[PDB]
């Protein structure tokens, strides 16, 4: 089948060779000549195929390379544009932390001041109710009551000071969170996103620390003033 | 030591004197102080209560005022990511399209050479037949058949060259297309990410194009070699030994 149709090729070639046998040298020479002519004919095309491989591969690069170049440029321009768009909001956050901590402070300190008013009102009434019992030694009564007014008001001033010092600690704890976000405008989008996704949580933790610390103050000082007045009652009253 | 007791008795010396004056009324005075202490509590209470409330209300207001900044910055960041994706997508789509279009242009400019080899084979074999015919008289049919067989074997090598050029242009296409696909997949949701694929893109295109160029460059000479060996085989078979 397949082996027989290979023998036929050999057989026929052997027969052609047998016919050409008396001219084997001439025939070998004519084949050698045609082989050189083949090489000469194929040569410019074999050479140009190699050149065209290099020319085409080069053309394909010159055509495709501008796309990566254009996309690299869009990416850089965008990163600049993003930074320019984000910076104003990052500066406004930093500014609002400071402005809102002062507003918080300013809405809390009036209470400490109002305590000073209620101390004055109460001591003046105490003086009026104690005056009939010390009509000749009113100087001593006044001095002792002025002394009490001072001691009581010093507690109201301490409340105001502790509120202010705690609002300031809150400011010094919130400001770095705004700096961290601002520092990440320069750098990776992931770093910026992590600081932005975590910002709210970190603000809460710090605000909660302030609220936890300042919340007891009002009741604490109310009891302090009461102790002061109760101390006077026990000192001046019966044994 | 123990002189704190001495110091404590010096400070309240005037208070001891005020007490000595109030002594006959100690009960009345204690009562009037107790009354004022209740009035004090009553007066301080709403402010002490409101201070506690306001601490909570203000701390909450600070939180609500600062939160929109992280929210606005997240919005600027997403609007930008949308804008970047919309700016990059046209170029990303055009790169994908040009890879395919330019690989076909490349293929179509290289295959004509293998076809031209088929022309040069025909010309050469026809000349070989003309130069061998005087020696094979009454045997032209054996000569022609053997030369047709040689023409076929030689042209099958030219057709293999055309096939290898096409298969290599296709390997180049299958190596360049994923680079465009990878970029096209990183346009949004991954920036670390897209920044890496974009910065590396040009370099990766070059490496693949160079691999094609390096593989296909020897082909022409290799095939030329093969045709020569075929004609040399005929010379050795038909010649003296």
UniProtKB/Swiss-Prot annotation, chain A:
Annotated stretches, region: 13 X 22 AA approximate tandem repeats: 1-237
Subcellular localization: Secreted
GN (gene name): APOA4
PTM text: Phosphorylation sites are present in the extracellular medium.
Pathology linked to this chain's protein: Tubulointerstitial kidney disease, autosomal dominant 6: A form of autosomal dominant tubulointerstitial kidney disease, a genetically heterogeneous disorder characterized by slowly progressive loss of kidney function, bland urinary sediment, hyperuricemia, absent or mildly increased albuminuria, lack of severe hypertension during the early stages, and normal or small kidneys on ultrasound.
Tissue: Synthesized primarily in the intestine and secreted in plasma.
UniProt source species: Homo sapiens (Human)
GO molecular function: antioxidant activity; cholesterol transfer activity; copper ion binding; identical protein binding; lipid binding; lipid transporter activity; phosphatidylcholine binding; phosphatidylcholine-sterol O-acyltransferase activator activity
Notes concerning its domains: Nine of the thirteen 22-amino acid tandem repeats (each 22-mer is actually a tandem array of two, A and B, related 11-mers) occurring in this sequence are predicted to be highly alpha-helical, and many of these helices are amphipathic. They may therefore serve as lipid-binding domains with lecithin:cholesterol acyltransferase (LCAT) activating abilities.
Sequence repeats: 22-43, 44-65, 66-87, 88-109, 110-131, 132-153, 154-175, 176-193, 194-215, 216-237
GO BP terms, alphabetized: acylglycerol homeostasis; cholesterol efflux; cholesterol homeostasis; cholesterol metabolic process; chylomicron assembly; chylomicron remodeling; high-density lipoprotein particle remodeling; hydrogen peroxide catabolic process
Subcellular location, principal: secreted
Subunit structure: Homodimer.
Role description: May have a role in chylomicrons and VLDL secretion and catabolism. Required for efficient activation of lipoprotein lipase by ApoC-II; potent activator of LCAT. Apoa-IV is a major component of HDL and chylomicrons.
Entry GO CC: blood microparticle; chylomicron; collagen-containing extracellular matrix; cytosol; early endosome; endoplasmic reticulum lumen; extracellular exosome; extracellular region
Alphabetical keyword list: Amyloidosis, Chylomicron, Disease variant, HDL, Lipid transport, Phosphoprotein, Repeat, Secreted, Signal, Transport
Protein name (record): Apolipoprotein A-IV
Reported impact of residue 171 to Q: In Seattle-2; may contribute to the development of familial combined hyperlipidemia
Record family assignment: Belongs to the apolipoprotein A1/A4/E family.
Organism superkingdom: Eukaryota
